[PDB]
Protein backbone atom coordinates (compact mmCIF):
# COMPACT_ATOMS: atom_id res chain seq x y z
CA UNK A 1 0.00 0.00 0.00
CA UNK A 2 2.15 3.04 -0.86
CA UNK A 3 1.36 6.07 -2.99
CA UNK A 4 2.69 7.08 -6.45
CA UNK A 5 1.91 10.24 -8.70
CA UNK A 6 1.46 10.14 -12.47
CA UNK A 7 1.58 13.26 -14.43
CA UNK A 8 -1.76 14.97 -15.79
CA UNK A 9 -0.79 17.82 -17.85
CA UNK A 10 1.06 21.17 -17.84
CA UNK A 11 0.22 24.05 -15.81
CA UNK A 12 -1.09 26.83 -18.90
CA UNK A 13 -3.95 29.24 -18.27
CA UNK A 14 -6.05 28.03 -21.10
CA UNK A 15 -7.14 31.39 -22.97
CA UNK A 16 -10.37 30.87 -24.10
CA UNK A 17 -11.84 28.24 -21.43
CA UNK A 18 11.17 12.10 -12.52
CA UNK A 19 10.46 15.43 -10.98
CA UNK A 20 9.40 17.44 -14.10
CA UNK A 21 7.17 20.46 -13.83
CA UNK A 22 3.13 20.08 -14.02
CA UNK A 23 -0.01 18.80 -12.12
CA UNK A 24 0.58 15.48 -11.12
CA UNK A 25 -2.47 12.98 -9.86
CA UNK A 26 -2.09 11.64 -6.24
CA UNK A 27 -2.51 7.74 -6.13
CA UNK A 28 -3.04 4.95 -3.94
CA UNK A 29 -2.74 1.23 -4.33
CA UNK A 30 -5.60 -0.63 -2.92
CA UNK A 31 -5.52 -4.78 -3.80
CA UNK A 32 -7.45 -4.83 -6.74
CA UNK A 33 -6.38 -1.48 -8.86
CA UNK A 34 -5.64 1.65 -7.56
CA UNK A 35 -7.17 5.17 -6.33
CA UNK A 36 -6.51 8.67 -7.40
CA UNK A 37 -6.59 10.35 -3.56
CA UNK A 38 -6.08 14.13 -4.51
CA UNK A 39 -3.76 16.25 -6.89
CA UNK A 40 -0.48 18.23 -6.88
CA UNK A 41 1.95 21.01 -8.06
CA UNK A 42 5.37 20.30 -9.05
CA UNK A 43 7.57 23.28 -9.20
CA UNK A 44 10.99 24.14 -9.42
CA UNK A 45 11.84 20.10 -7.97
CA UNK A 46 9.23 20.37 -5.79
CA UNK A 47 5.49 18.70 -5.46
CA UNK A 48 2.82 20.31 -3.75
CA UNK A 49 -0.04 18.68 -2.49
CA UNK A 50 -2.97 18.94 1.03
CA UNK A 51 -1.79 17.46 4.00
CA UNK A 52 -5.15 15.15 4.36
CA UNK A 53 -3.87 13.36 0.69
CA UNK A 54 -0.76 12.49 2.10
CA UNK A 55 -1.23 12.45 5.31
CA UNK A 56 2.91 12.92 5.04
CA UNK A 57 2.94 9.62 3.71
CA UNK A 58 6.33 9.35 1.23
CA UNK A 59 5.26 9.36 -2.71
CA UNK A 60 6.76 7.54 -5.49
CA UNK A 61 7.73 9.03 -8.87
CA UNK A 62 8.93 6.38 -11.16
CA UNK A 63 11.57 4.34 -10.44
CA UNK A 64 12.81 6.97 -7.51
CA UNK A 65 10.88 8.09 -4.25
CA UNK A 66 10.28 11.97 -2.54
CA UNK A 67 10.43 12.38 0.94
CA UNK A 68 8.41 15.07 2.34
CA UNK A 69 10.02 18.02 3.42
CA UNK A 70 7.58 20.49 5.30
CA UNK A 71 4.12 19.91 6.47
CA UNK A 72 1.39 22.19 8.35
CA UNK A 73 -1.82 20.49 9.33
CA UNK A 74 -3.67 23.46 10.44
CA UNK A 75 -3.21 24.90 6.95
CA UNK A 76 -3.82 21.61 5.28
CA UNK A 77 -0.40 21.52 3.01
CA UNK A 78 2.41 19.72 2.78
CA UNK A 79 5.55 19.72 0.13
CA UNK A 80 8.33 16.95 -0.90
CA UNK A 81 11.84 17.59 -1.56
CA UNK A 82 11.76 21.05 -0.72
CA UNK A 83 10.39 24.27 0.80
CA UNK A 84 7.10 25.52 0.05
CA UNK A 85 7.52 27.47 -3.45
CA UNK A 86 3.76 28.51 -4.82
CA UNK A 87 4.34 32.00 -3.29
CA UNK A 88 2.04 33.98 -5.58
CA UNK A 89 -1.63 35.61 -4.30
CA UNK A 90 -4.67 36.74 -5.91
CA UNK A 91 -5.44 40.25 -5.87
CA UNK A 92 -9.16 39.34 -5.03
CA UNK A 93 -10.70 40.95 -8.20
CA UNK A 94 -9.98 39.30 -11.27
CA UNK A 95 -10.89 35.94 -12.13
CA UNK A 96 -8.96 32.81 -12.07
CA UNK A 97 -8.81 29.19 -13.45
CA UNK A 98 -9.26 25.96 -11.52
CA UNK A 99 -7.23 23.06 -13.92
CA UNK A 100 -8.87 20.53 -12.04
CA UNK A 101 -7.49 16.84 -12.72
CA UNK A 102 -10.70 14.65 -11.92
CA UNK A 103 -10.47 11.06 -11.02
CA UNK A 104 -10.75 8.66 -14.55
CA UNK A 105 -10.89 12.39 -16.49
CA UNK A 106 -8.47 14.42 -18.22
CA UNK A 107 -7.31 17.87 -17.53
CA UNK A 108 -9.63 21.18 -17.63
CA UNK A 109 -9.44 24.63 -16.67
CA UNK A 110 -12.49 26.49 -15.78
CA UNK A 111 -12.89 30.18 -15.62
CA UNK A 112 -14.56 31.62 -12.56
CA UNK A 113 -14.85 33.78 -10.00
CA UNK A 114 -14.32 32.91 -6.39
CA UNK A 115 -16.11 33.86 -3.49
CA UNK A 116 -15.06 35.61 -0.36
CA UNK A 117 -14.90 34.23 3.22
CA UNK A 118 -15.01 35.93 6.73
CA UNK A 119 -12.29 33.26 8.50
CA UNK A 120 -10.85 34.03 11.83
CA UNK A 121 -7.06 35.27 10.64
CA UNK A 122 -8.66 38.07 7.14
CA UNK A 123 -11.16 36.49 4.84
CA UNK A 124 -10.41 34.29 2.44
CA UNK A 125 -11.21 33.45 -1.44
CA UNK A 126 -13.03 30.05 -2.42
CA UNK A 127 -13.69 28.28 -5.54
CA UNK A 128 -17.50 27.50 -5.73
CA UNK A 129 -17.26 24.69 -7.70
CA UNK A 130 -18.08 20.56 -7.19
CA UNK A 131 -15.51 17.55 -7.97
CA UNK A 132 -15.51 13.87 -6.97
CA UNK A 133 -13.54 13.24 -4.11
CA UNK A 134 -9.83 12.62 -5.14
CA UNK A 135 -9.79 16.23 -7.23
CA UNK A 136 -8.49 18.27 -3.92
CA UNK A 137 -5.34 19.68 -4.42
CA UNK A 138 -6.32 21.11 -7.95
CA UNK A 139 -4.16 23.98 -9.29
CA UNK A 140 -6.00 27.58 -9.20
CA UNK A 141 -4.17 29.98 -11.84
CA UNK A 142 -4.16 34.02 -12.30
CA UNK A 143 -3.97 35.14 -15.86
CA UNK A 144 -0.55 34.94 -15.50
CA UNK A 145 -0.63 31.08 -15.25
CA UNK A 146 1.09 31.31 -11.57
CA UNK A 147 -0.58 28.82 -8.98
CA UNK A 148 -2.32 31.04 -6.38
CA UNK A 149 -3.64 28.40 -4.52
CA UNK A 150 -5.38 24.43 -4.31
CA UNK A 151 -8.98 23.40 -4.60
CA UNK A 152 -9.89 22.43 -1.57
CA UNK A 153 -8.09 25.21 0.25
CA UNK A 154 -9.04 28.37 0.05
CA UNK A 155 -7.18 31.03 -2.21
CA UNK A 156 -5.16 33.92 -0.29
CA UNK A 157 -5.90 37.08 -0.73
CA UNK A 158 -2.89 39.73 -0.95
CA UNK B 1 -5.85 17.13 13.46
CA UNK B 2 -9.35 17.37 14.65
CA UNK B 3 -10.64 14.09 13.01
CA UNK B 4 -14.27 13.03 13.54
CA UNK B 5 -16.77 10.74 12.60
CA UNK B 6 -21.09 11.07 11.74
CA UNK B 7 -23.15 7.63 11.47
CA UNK B 8 -23.96 6.94 7.90
CA UNK B 9 -26.46 4.11 8.70
CA UNK B 10 -27.41 0.34 10.13
CA UNK B 11 -25.02 -2.60 9.30
CA UNK B 12 -27.63 -4.91 7.24
CA UNK B 13 -28.00 -6.90 4.77
CA UNK B 14 -30.29 -6.05 2.28
CA UNK B 15 -31.76 -9.12 0.70
CA UNK B 16 -32.41 -7.79 -2.91
CA UNK B 17 -29.87 -4.93 -3.54
CA UNK B 18 -27.98 -4.57 -6.67
CA UNK B 19 -25.84 -7.24 -7.74
CA UNK B 20 -22.77 -7.64 -10.23
CA UNK B 21 -22.55 -10.25 -13.07
CA UNK B 22 -17.27 9.21 24.83
CA UNK B 23 -20.24 10.86 23.23
CA UNK B 24 -21.52 8.09 20.91
CA UNK B 25 -20.60 4.76 20.06
CA UNK B 26 -23.31 3.13 18.65
CA UNK B 27 -23.25 0.12 16.13
CA UNK B 28 -23.49 0.97 12.93
CA UNK B 29 -21.29 2.13 9.97
CA UNK B 30 -19.87 5.44 10.20
CA UNK B 31 -18.02 8.29 7.36
CA UNK B 32 -14.58 9.07 8.79
CA UNK B 33 -14.33 13.18 8.66
CA UNK B 34 -11.01 15.47 8.62
CA UNK B 35 -12.32 19.23 9.28
CA UNK B 36 -10.33 22.03 6.79
CA UNK B 37 -10.28 25.15 6.91
CA UNK B 38 -13.54 25.93 4.28
CA UNK B 39 -15.25 22.95 5.05
CA UNK B 40 -14.94 19.03 5.31
CA UNK B 41 -13.91 15.84 3.42
CA UNK B 42 -14.20 12.06 4.27
CA UNK B 43 -11.34 10.00 4.16
CA UNK B 44 -12.43 7.08 5.15
CA UNK B 45 -15.38 4.62 6.60
CA UNK B 46 -15.73 2.70 9.67
CA UNK B 47 -17.48 0.14 11.43
CA UNK B 48 -18.87 0.85 15.22
CA UNK B 49 -19.20 -2.45 17.17
CA UNK B 50 -19.40 -4.00 20.66
CA UNK B 51 -18.42 -0.32 21.75
CA UNK B 52 -15.31 -0.19 19.68
CA UNK B 53 -14.64 1.68 16.72
CA UNK B 54 -12.83 -0.16 13.45
CA UNK B 55 -11.36 1.42 10.32
CA UNK B 56 -8.16 1.55 7.95
CA UNK B 57 -4.73 2.51 9.34
CA UNK B 58 -3.76 4.68 6.85
CA UNK B 59 -7.51 6.26 7.26
CA UNK B 60 -6.81 7.98 10.72
CA UNK B 61 -2.49 7.37 10.94
CA UNK B 62 -3.14 6.49 14.89
CA UNK B 63 -5.29 10.03 15.19
CA UNK B 64 -7.60 10.43 17.73
CA UNK B 65 -11.63 10.34 16.85
CA UNK B 66 -14.03 12.90 17.78
CA UNK B 67 -17.94 11.27 18.01
CA UNK B 68 -20.29 13.62 19.57
CA UNK B 69 -18.73 15.83 22.51
CA UNK B 70 -16.65 13.21 23.13
CA UNK B 71 -13.40 11.70 22.28
CA UNK B 72 -12.27 8.04 20.78
CA UNK B 73 -8.20 7.07 21.28
CA UNK B 74 -7.25 4.13 19.20
CA UNK B 75 -6.36 0.91 21.36
CA UNK B 76 -4.95 -0.87 18.49
CA UNK B 77 -3.06 -0.64 15.15
CA UNK B 78 -1.00 -2.53 12.61
CA UNK B 79 0.18 -1.50 9.69
CA UNK B 80 1.31 -4.02 7.71
CA UNK B 81 -2.59 -4.95 8.03
CA UNK B 82 -3.42 -1.50 7.83
CA UNK B 83 -6.05 -1.90 10.62
CA UNK B 84 -6.91 0.49 13.70
CA UNK B 85 -8.95 -0.03 16.31
CA UNK B 86 -10.78 2.87 19.16
CA UNK B 87 -11.41 1.90 23.13
CA UNK B 88 -10.95 -1.81 22.98
CA UNK B 89 -9.33 -4.73 20.90
CA UNK B 90 -10.67 -5.65 17.01
CA UNK B 91 -13.74 -7.59 17.70
CA UNK B 92 -14.39 -8.49 14.07
CA UNK B 93 -13.57 -11.67 13.95
CA UNK B 94 -16.01 -13.24 11.45
CA UNK B 95 -14.80 -14.46 8.09
CA UNK B 96 -15.94 -15.23 4.24
CA UNK B 97 -16.29 -19.26 3.37
CA UNK B 98 -14.15 -18.39 0.18
CA UNK B 99 -18.11 -19.77 -1.71
CA UNK B 100 -20.86 -17.34 -1.70
CA UNK B 101 -21.61 -13.65 -2.34
CA UNK B 102 -21.04 -11.39 -0.19
CA UNK B 103 -22.05 -7.33 0.30
CA UNK B 104 -20.36 -4.16 -0.14
CA UNK B 105 -21.94 -2.04 1.59
CA UNK B 106 -20.31 1.71 0.62
CA UNK B 107 -20.23 4.61 1.86
CA UNK B 108 -19.19 6.92 -0.79
CA UNK B 109 -18.41 10.56 -0.32
CA UNK B 110 -21.68 12.88 -0.11
CA UNK B 111 -23.47 10.08 -0.96
CA UNK B 112 -25.76 7.20 0.84
CA UNK B 113 -25.03 4.29 1.94
CA UNK B 114 -25.59 1.49 -0.75
CA UNK B 115 -25.53 -2.16 -0.33
CA UNK B 116 -23.92 -4.55 -3.59
CA UNK B 117 -23.57 -8.20 -3.98
CA UNK B 118 -20.54 -9.93 -5.56
CA UNK B 119 -18.24 -12.74 -5.51
CA UNK B 120 -15.22 -11.51 -4.61
CA UNK B 121 -11.88 -13.55 -6.57
CA UNK B 122 -9.38 -15.47 -4.85
CA UNK B 123 -5.66 -15.08 -4.33
CA UNK B 124 -2.53 -16.45 -3.20
CA UNK B 125 0.95 -16.01 3.81
CA UNK B 126 -2.32 -17.65 3.15
CA UNK B 127 -5.33 -16.94 0.68
CA UNK B 128 -7.38 -13.99 0.52
CA UNK B 129 -10.42 -12.61 -0.93
CA UNK B 130 -10.72 -9.77 -2.70
CA UNK B 131 -13.93 -7.05 -3.88
CA UNK B 132 -12.93 -5.99 -7.65
CA UNK B 133 -14.84 -2.53 -7.64
CA UNK B 134 -14.20 0.73 -8.49
CA UNK B 135 -14.95 3.36 -5.47
CA UNK B 136 -13.81 7.06 -4.97
CA UNK B 137 -10.84 7.93 -2.04
CA UNK B 138 -12.63 8.05 1.25
CA UNK B 139 -14.60 5.05 0.25
CA UNK B 140 -12.07 3.00 2.35
CA UNK B 141 -12.58 1.18 5.47
CA UNK B 142 -16.63 0.46 4.02
CA UNK B 143 -17.57 -3.07 5.72
CA UNK B 144 -18.32 -6.57 3.34
CA UNK B 145 -20.85 -8.62 4.68
CA UNK B 146 -21.62 -12.10 4.35
CA UNK B 147 -25.86 -13.02 4.50
CA UNK B 148 -25.73 -13.32 8.28
CA UNK B 149 -25.05 -9.07 8.16
CA UNK B 150 -21.46 -10.07 9.92
CA UNK B 151 -18.42 -7.77 9.06
CA UNK B 152 -16.31 -10.06 7.02
CA UNK B 153 -13.91 -7.63 5.87
CA UNK B 154 -13.22 -3.71 5.27
CA UNK B 155 -13.06 -1.78 1.89
CA UNK B 156 -9.47 -1.49 0.67
CA UNK B 157 -8.37 -4.76 2.62
CA UNK B 158 -8.98 -8.20 1.91
CA UNK B 159 -11.86 -10.60 2.65
CA UNK B 160 -10.27 -12.86 5.21
CA UNK B 161 -10.88 -16.90 4.21
CA UNK B 162 -12.32 -19.48 6.44
CA UNK B 163 -8.82 -20.31 7.76
Given at each position: VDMYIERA???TWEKDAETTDGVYRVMTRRLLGSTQVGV???QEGVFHTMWHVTKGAALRSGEGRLDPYWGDVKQDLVSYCGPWKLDAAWDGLSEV???A???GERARNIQTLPGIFKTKDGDI???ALDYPAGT???PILDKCGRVIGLYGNGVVIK
Open positions: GDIGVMQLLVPPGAVSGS
